[PDB]
Amino acid sequence: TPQVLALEVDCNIECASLLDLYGQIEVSRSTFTYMKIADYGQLGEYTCDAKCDAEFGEPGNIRHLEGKTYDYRGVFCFNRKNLQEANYDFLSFMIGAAQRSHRINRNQALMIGKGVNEPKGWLTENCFPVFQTLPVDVNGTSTPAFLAQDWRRFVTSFPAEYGEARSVMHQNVFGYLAAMVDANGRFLFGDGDLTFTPDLVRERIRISNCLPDPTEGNTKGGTGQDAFAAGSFVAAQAAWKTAFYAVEKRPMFFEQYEGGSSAWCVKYQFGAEDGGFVGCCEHGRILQI
Amino acid sequence: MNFNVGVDFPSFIAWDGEESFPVKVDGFNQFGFTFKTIAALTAATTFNIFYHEPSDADPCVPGPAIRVPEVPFCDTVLLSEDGLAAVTLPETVTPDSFCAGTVPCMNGQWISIAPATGSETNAANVQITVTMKGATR
Amino acid sequence: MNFNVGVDFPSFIAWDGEESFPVKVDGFNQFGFTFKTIAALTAATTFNIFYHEPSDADPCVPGPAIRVPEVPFCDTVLLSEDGLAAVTLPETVTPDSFCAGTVPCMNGQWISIAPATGSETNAANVQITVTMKGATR
């Protein structure tokens, strides 16, 4: 007889995730609304102690704006007798894979959500201030390129008053950066180390592969071969706990779709409700070509 | 899930860029103006505001165009020429950039907006609508 | 006590009798439809709804105009021959009574209303405009 152990290999990668960085907000019935405090107007004037009167100042705006939340639905069958036999539990696996697919679709939505019935992605919305690299004039052509100087000047130019802000990019980008060399043949940044290794634990490096990389796979743009493609996205940096907000309404729910199911079949119905919006995009900044 | 917002705050055309239109506000209690530029302007453009009375020939037709007067409050110390409700959209107001306005105190039966003398050719490139609020009929 | 209702529910011209107007519903997330006749009707009239996508030229300018497929709710009895959403203003509607409308599911970044063919003469006496509700930014 065969032996049964209690381990299960997965061998399936989801992605890197950016749902932890965004400002989490739990909500209720749809059409949420909140405040948009615009700018505190200069109230005082400063005073010499001579006059028996003050002077007024400009007021500010509030702009109680709002937003809608979107939903996610799905259905799937099951045989009835096939479920009692066939020792493995198909039901829990379907539940888990549905929650996971919903999670990955949520992650894709918050980044590149295309407007209509799609949580407006902060990439396509584009109210973030964006800087771009400068081209280099190799043998008199001024081709678009990118070196570490542009990276620093992008990361440092951030106003530290906003608080500590996280920077995100693709792992192909991290690799291409780490693969930079001086004229000596010596390394570049991330110098002293046979380690390199993207620790990235909290400090300013963070990687997601389900972001658009400007390396077109690899060995592209930047490479001894064909030059780089301009206008391509590179990286972002924001205080996501306040730069962009993700809103949740109802956990993934499943239900036996009574009606359409019989003593020989079962039909199910699952759904959930979530969304996201931009917070103060005047915090985060983007790097392009 | 856009609700039917026709009922519950409808709107009408007030200034098409070529001629004004009286829009009844008697059946409502709150209202405001929405301005929108169709092209780049040339200078700060002024608009005069008027209100009408029911022409006694017919209680549902336009009478004359009385000019609503400007009303001040605490810090308003910039009164106009003895007081007349009139607005002015400044320069640096591009397309896809709309503006908002209202009148502090109601008077008459309906409002109308007209290009102030000198701002006509620029008014030819602006669209103004009116939206109401709160009506019970 | 009127509130400034231009900072909420800003309205835009859609059809001033003889000219369509693409309105951008990107930032907003609820919007309706207000029809106002200005003169007497002759026959019933219909209007076709279209929607636009961001033209590759400029991401915040409209592209072409694609018809909008209507989705029917539960408890529907017919389907417009093509399935493309279109509204009807019936005959015998006096030019002092608004009419409300709302598509239940949007698509695209610009909405547009056009006089359905064979009913263009009456379109002159029709004026259509839309307000919005959401801000999102």
């Binding site: 800087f131 392009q288 | 503006c99 306005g101 | -």
Partner: peptide, 19 residues
């Protein structure tokens, strides 16, 4: 007398600072 909206222009920029 006011509202806000800014298309998206966003005009990406360079930094340039050599020795």
């Amino acid at each position: 007398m006011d509202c806000r909206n800014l298309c998206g222009a966003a005009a990406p920029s360079r930094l340039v600072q050599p020795g």
